Structure formats: structure tokens, C-alpha cells
Structure 1
């Protein structure tokens, strides 16, 4: 099917200011979107904020201010942060949006009409901080803010509380068999593979029904009322997950402001998501609850859920209270935006919990960005080596030349598959494997010596080098968006050849193309003092 490629991040609780976790989730979403735009596809990338619920409402009361004023303020901080991070998100959704609210009521009514919502009770544990229902197998003993003994989530360590309430219940138990069919029939639907196995095991063990409303008082009336029953509010998670459907149905103007909500998602050709980017903490909501609601409502299921891991700094938990911070905008101003994005995407795979340190960040910046990529770009554009400031016409290729050309020809296919898993780390590693091979080749051929000794041979070496850089840069462009433009400028690559699968082919830029102009002190990535 030809269709708008639809990629999403979670929508983030606005109980607190934005931080690395949010920036990372949205980065992954942004990169996936950027790559598909580079392939020439229509892309709609979504992010935003989750603004209802007890968690948020009680965060606002702690700051002694109105929930409307509080959410709007913090939502503005999330936007400012994402603007500063230089993402290419198509829309920023807020669950306070009135059009979103209409979609929630619409979905709720669909589930009710389908017979999958009934009036029951939940008597059990709840984590307000995770807005999550827990069974007694998932709590243990712990300590609250005071120091008193209490119960806490095994999953997250936050304080749990006992809830006994007459609630509207969704028949999640009735979807066990169909969810299992879905997971089996689509073995690529959850990534990485071990989290897919985690989900299957959980659903195999059995599913209870899920409380999809709460009494209005306990949410401090900060939620969407249940259609036909003003005494109840919709479960913040059913509300939240619906953002993906809302987003798929919003027409957005040039400025990024929402202007219209269509009736039928087919109208905008986005739904269902091709990739839901999420953190491991919220897997069950997306891989169990979400598809169950969609199945009930007769809506199509997402194609892929990708769940990444948690971050630490110097092998310690990131926390303002513990005295170990990681401000992304600060580190970006220190080391560069593209470089910081490279590091976060390179350093950790989705299977792992990543670890920043200034030491490791400087090693990759110097080692990979400067010594490997940057050094190569300067060499093939140098007036000392490339004396006519153009793309030369290659002479006959040696077997060594062709071994390199082969790697470059194969790179797009390989990087493509990795981006579609998606596994951004492996894609980056693949591109840099080819970059290391180009450097070895250049070291081997010594083009600086060829300038005087064998100009005809230099044409070949120089042409292959320029073309390897172009291709490696194109495939890295979703990761180093600003620097890829500088590189393409330096190579003098026309705009048209900077996107499209056509330009994945070796030899897309013709000989005689003139390099862009030099600058007296310019350099792509500057080496940082080794500390």
C-alpha cells in the first residue's frame, strides 16, 4: 500500500520539565521520519504531551497553581526544548486539545457499542506515577518520601496505593487469543525481539479486564468525562493512546497549528502507525492494551512497536535530587547538536541501557566524527589534493578500487534494512564501516603523492573517495541533518541529488561537478580537549 509513513513518539507526562528521556524518544522518532523523507516518501511524524490524570493534577497542586495554567506552561517547555533540539516533527499534539477529546469520546462510544465495556469494580494496587494497574506479584516493600514503610512497584519503584472503586471495565480478557494470533502472524511487530517474547509470555499467562474509567473525585476532575456518565472520567491511558488516532486525523497548516479534524482516518492516509517509538517502561500499554482497543473498535493495528532502553550518566541514575544531571541542550551547546544526536544513537542499542560520559562522548566525537568522517571530507576537497576543485572523471579501476566500490554499492541496501527494523545503531555502524574502508583506501593510495607522480591515477582515487563520502553522508543525513548539508555543500552536490532512492546509486553525481567554495578557517567537527 502507498500511504503516508506514520511514525510516533510517546506523548509525555507534563508533571515535570523535559529531560534526556523525552529528548531521546523523540529523537528516534525524528530520525526514522527523516530517513523515510530522504527515500522520498510522504511522512507524518508525531509527538506531544499527555496532560490529564492524577499524576499531572497532583503535580500542579504541589506547585499551587491551576491544572490549565500548569499544563500549558510545561507543554510550552516541551515545545521550546524540541524546537531547540532541531527536530523535524510534523505535529505536536496535546491531550487537552478539544479535537482530541472528540476522538476519545468517539472511540469510547465505539468500544461500548461493540459490547466490550461494562460496569464493574477494580479492587487492587495502582501506581499513580505510572498511571498503571498492578497485581500483587508486581509490588514489594519500600520507603515513601517520609521514610515510612509502604508498598512500591517492582517495575518502577514508585509508591503504590490500594484502589477500590466502581469503574467501567474493558473486556481485555476476551482479546487474549486474537493478540496472540497477531504477535505470531507478525513476528516483526515488536522490536527488539526479547521484548516481543516478554509480551507473548505475559499474554500467554492470561489477561484480566482493564479499568478504563475512574471516579471523578480521585482524578481531581482533570480528565475527559465518560460519554453518558459525568461521574466517571476516562482512564488517562485510553485517553493518551488515542492521541495516535487523533493525530492521524488532523489537518495541519504551514505554521504547524491544527486546523481541522476529519471524520475518517482514511482521508489523510496515516493510520495505523508504521512505527510507534516507545520506552521499555510503557510496552504493555502499546503492545497489549492498544491493539486490544483497536481490535474491539475494528481499526487496523500498528505495523511495528519499537521499545528502547533507559539512560544512566557515569553508571549512575540521572536525577536532580541525587546530584547527577544530563541537560541535553547544555551538552549540545558544548559538543554540538548533530554530534550529541550521533552519540545517543551510536552509543546505545535498543536492547541496552546506554551510558553517557564526557570521556566516551569525546572519544566518539574525535574518533568517529572528526578522525574518520571529517578528515575524509577535508582530504577529498583539499586544494592540495583536489587541485581543480571538481569531481574528476575516473580512469580504469583496479581490483582494489572495485572492492571499495562494491562496499559503497552495497551500503544503501544494508543501511536501509537496518533503518526499517528499526535499528539505528546498526545502520550507523554499517555506514562507518564503509567510512573506515574509504580511509584505509586513501591511506593506501596516498593521493597527496599521486598529485605530482600520477595525475591520471589520482582522478580514479579521488572520484571513488568523493562518491563514497557522498553516499555515506546521504545515509547519515537523518542522523547529522545540519552537518550533512555542510558536507554536501563542500562537495558541491546539487540539491536534487541530496534525496531520493535514485541517489543511493554509485555514480549519481557526474564528473565535472564543481566543489563548493572554501572558507579561511572552516572545519566540520573540531577535536575537543581530551578530558
Structure 2
């Protein structure tokens, strides 16, 4: 049948206001999903939210709300954003749903019966704003009193770390140390980019995998341990199983789970890769489940010094295509990006409105002026330049694909704009207005317009994963009504338009 592809975003904390960093994660996963659906995969694209823990409970407590009411309100605004960004997620998984909660209970009960989980006491440091256990030496701005650390802050968030000293269940992750290390030997590509692996092994595995405190006795808000209801399951164990619980794991019908698991990519930001690539594999080893194929960790979007840009405000001012394009263009593979408002409008006005927007405008006007809208049919590479430009178009599809497969979206986008820049330069080289003056050069004039439009069609098809408005408008104004000419397989042979087409007599702007 159709080959499967399962890609996931991380499930986010409904903590206040989403930022372009979480919008990047969701837009990039959508670009993957849309891209894979265009290639003829059976794609499942999952996102969701992380609703349990002390952090969320304190936020709802501070708000003067219940957890569900506070959550329901935050989740409503999160989903408002995804609908506006136009995310093609096949499912949305909330951890407060019983279809999730029952899987967390059964996974915990099972690990207890295996002897993988045992009871004890965690003493040490914890950042509730990070939901992360820390050791003495990991603390930032530590407090020494008679040679002993009695306080500090989190290296991630910079928030004050608090002392934990309570009864807790421990997942024996220490005994999977060599098996996880052997997994990295067999599968060195597991973490993409590979540059993020060695720091993560050096910081988190080398000093010794301490057993992970996987339950909590102090707070109330979370999945309760069924054998011992006073214990509430740790948020990160609770959260991690959303990728399998949403597929119907440990239900009557695991047909969706057998189909889509293991996941092809787990997409995330670089500060939560330790959970998905140490704990998440060790956990699946304990459940005897096949591990993920990739864990793509992307960089941050900095603010000219360090890390309050609202996606909503960008979409309202400059449109969706501008905001979506900017995100994928300005964050490279293995790098962080800077948001500057100057950089944003340059990318919106010069790349979209001018380079692509005015290419379609220049082309359609010349077809209206020189042929009254009747765009001539494609014959062949009749012009001197056509042969290497047609090869350029097929190399653009080739190079783009290689960039899309290795998760280099800014390089694929720069490759496509190289081609759009060429197509604009083709107007300057051919000088169609000089061909229009001669009656014997009508055949060559029509060749240039047909190549102009076929170059645009190539670009619009390649931008369908990235841009959800522009290609669709481009086909309407050009009057390309065949939905097969909007697919990737129509780019295999240049010059698909063999019958003439009546283009629009009222060309309107593609971009706002």
C-alpha cells in the first residue's frame, strides 16, 4: 500500500505565551509532513500539550483557577495559533485525556512488576520551572556554606532551584548504560545534526547514569501510580509516552500503533534532546519497543543578544507566508538564528514580494500585452539559453530534495530562490520587448513566456510545503487548473504545458 511516515513535535507546556521558537518546531514539522504527503507517504503528524506537573499546577493556582479551566483556556489559544499557522497535524494529544493517562498508568505498573521501578527517596535539587532534576555541580550561581552547596539556579532557565527530600519511585536506567552506548555505536546518525551528540553524551552519560526519580509525593497534579495512589507520575515520563499512547498503545486496537511506530523523526529544540535520546530510548528498551529512527534537534531563535517576538503579531502585520518563510529560511541546520525586524521585512519584501511576487507580475503582464492573455504552448528549448536553464530547473528539484531529506530547509529555500532569481534574469537576457517588435520573432517570444511560466510552476510546486497561500494563488492567476501539475511528478520532465492557456486579465498581488 502507501509507505508510512510518523513525525512528531514536542508536546508543549501551556505556560502563557508561545514564542516563534515553538512556532518554528510546529512549522518545520508541518513542512516535513506536507513534503512527505506530496511524495506519496501515509503521513501521521502529531503535536499536543504537556498539562501535568507542579509548574502547571502553580500557574493555575497563581491564576486563581482550576487546572482544567486554566489548561482549557491556554490550549484554546495554542490551537488558535496552529489553525492560523495552518499546521496539518493529523492528531492533537493532551496529557489530561484518559486515552493517554491509562497508558502512563499501565507503563508504570508494568515497570514496577518487572522490577525496573523500585521505591526510595530522592534527595537533591529541582527546578519546577524547568521540571528537571539537577545535581550540585550543574547549579548556576551556587551557594556554599561550610563547603556544601545549599542553593543555586538552573543552567537552562536561570530560576532558583529548590531542595527535594521526599519518597520517590526510581526507574533503574543505570543498567541500560552500555546498551544505550552500543546503540550510538550502531546508529551514529540517530541525533541530527550529529554535532549535538558528543556534548550530550559527555554532559549526561559519561559521569554515570544515576537512577531517575520517576514519581512524586508532594504535589497532586499528574497521573497517579495505580498501586500507590499517593504517588503522582513524573511529568517527563508522563509526557514522553504521548508519541505511543496517541497511536493506541496498550489498547484493544493497536492497528495505528503497528502502522506508525517506530517514529521516523522526533523534532524538538536543543535543550530537551537528553530526554528524547537517553531516557526515551532506555524507557522503550524496558517496554521492549522499537526505538525512533531520528531525533532532529534544531537551534534557537535569538534576539540580537539572547532570546518576545509574537507569531500572531507577525502573521497579522505581514501575512502567514511571510512568517512561515522567514522561520524556515533564517534557522539553519546545526545553528541558531537571530530575529531582527529589519531582517524580517527584507526577507518579506525583497525575497517574496519582489523576487517571486514581481516575477509572476512581470510574466503575466507580458503574456497579456504580447498575446492578449493566450499563453503559447511549450514546444522545446528554442532559445539559446533554454537548454542550460531547463537543466537548471531539474537540478533545482534535485538539489532541493537532498536538502529536504537531510532537514536543511534554509538551504532548500535558498536553492529555489537561486532559480527564481535566474527566471527574473531570463527576462533581462532574452529582452522579450525587442522580440515583440518583430513579426518573425513571435515564435521565439512565445517560447520565452512559456519558459517563464514553466519556471514559475516549478518554484510554486517546490514551495507548497513552505507556503500555503502563494503557490495556490500562482496557479489561479496562471490558470493552471490540472492538480497533477501542482505535484512533484510533473517536474520530472520540463515543459508540461503543451496546450495554450488563457491567463488572468486582472493580475493581483500574490503577497500582501
SS in structure 2 at match of 1:249? coil
Which residue in the other structure is 1:370 paired with? Answer: 353
Which residue in the other structure is 2:284 paired with? Answer: 294
For the 8 Å contact 1:497–1:508, the answer to whether it is kept is no
SS in structure 1 at match of 2:435? helix
1:506 matched to 2:508? The reply is: no
Aligned-residue offset at 1:470 = 1.1
Structure 1 residues 235 and 508, CA gap change in structure 2 (3 angstroms): farther
Which residue in the other structure is 1:54 paired with? Answer: 54
Aligned-residue offset at 1:340 = 1.0
Which residue in the other structure is 1:257 paired with? Answer: none
Structure 1 unaligned spans of 5+: 144-148, 251-259, 319-324, 527-531
TM (norm. structure 2) is 0.92
Structure 2 unaligned spans of 5+: 144-149
Aligned-residue offset at 1:384 = 2.3
Aligned-residue offset at 1:386 = 5.5
Which residue in the other structure is 1:477 paired with? Answer: 464
Aligned-residue offset at 1:14 = 1.4
SS in structure 2 at match of 1:231? coil
Aligned-residue offset at 1:316 = 4.4
1:275 to 252, 265, 268: 265
CA distance in 1, matches of 2:258, 2:496: 35
Aligned residues: 501
1:335 matched to 2:306? The reply is: no
SS in structure 2 at match of 1:123? strand
Per-residue CA distance 1:38-71 (angstroms, 9 max, x = gap): 2122111111111000000011111111112111
After TM superposition, the structure 1 = structure 2 runs for residues 8-407 of structure 1, keeping only pairs within 5 Å, are 8-141=8-141, 150-201=151-202, 202-215=204-217, 218-219=218-219, 221-249=220-248, 263-264=253-254, 269-313=259-303, 315-317=304-306, 325-382=308-365, 383-385=368-370, 387-398=372-383, 400-407=385-392
1:423 to 408, 431, 434: 408
CA distance in 2, matches of 1:2, 1:189: 25
Per-residue CA distance 1:283-337 (angstroms, 9 max, x = gap): 1111111111111111111111111222233x1445xxxxxx4221111111111
Aligned-residue offset at 1:182 = 2.3
CA distance in 2, matches of 1:240, 1:45: 17
SS in structure 2 at match of 1:10? coil
CA distance in 1, matches of 2:64, 2:196: 40
Structure 1 residues 465 and 262, CA gap change in structure 2 (3 angstroms): farther
SS in structure 1 at match of 2:375? coil
For the 8 Å contact 1:379–1:385, the answer to whether it is kept is no
For the 8 Å contact 2:168–2:214, the answer to whether it is kept is yes
Aligned-residue offset at 1:37 = 1.3
CA distance in 2, matches of 1:100, 1:400: 59
Aligned-residue offset at 1:267 = 5.2
Which residue in the other structure is 2:511 paired with? Answer: 525
Q: Indicate the larger mover: 478-487 or 156-165.
A: 156-165
CA distance in 2, matches of 1:493, 1:352: 38
For the 8 Å contact 2:101–2:223, the answer to whether it is kept is yes
Structure 1 residues 268 and 490, CA gap change in structure 2 (3 angstroms): farther
For the 8 Å contact 2:375–2:446, the answer to whether it is kept is no
CA distance in 1, matches of 2:292, 2:482: 34
> RMSD over aligned Cα, in angstroms?
2.3
CA distance in 2, matches of 1:354, 1:411: 25
Aligned-residue offset at 1:480 = 0.7
Aligned-residue offset at 1:500 = 4.1
Which residue in the other structure is 1:146 paired with? Answer: none
Aligned-residue offset at 1:461 = 2.2
Higher strand share: 1
For the 8 Å contact 2:216–2:234, the answer to whether it is kept is yes
CA distance in 1, matches of 2:252, 2:474: 41
Per-residue CA distance 1:62-109 (angstroms, 9 max, x = gap): 111111211111111111222222222212111000110111122223
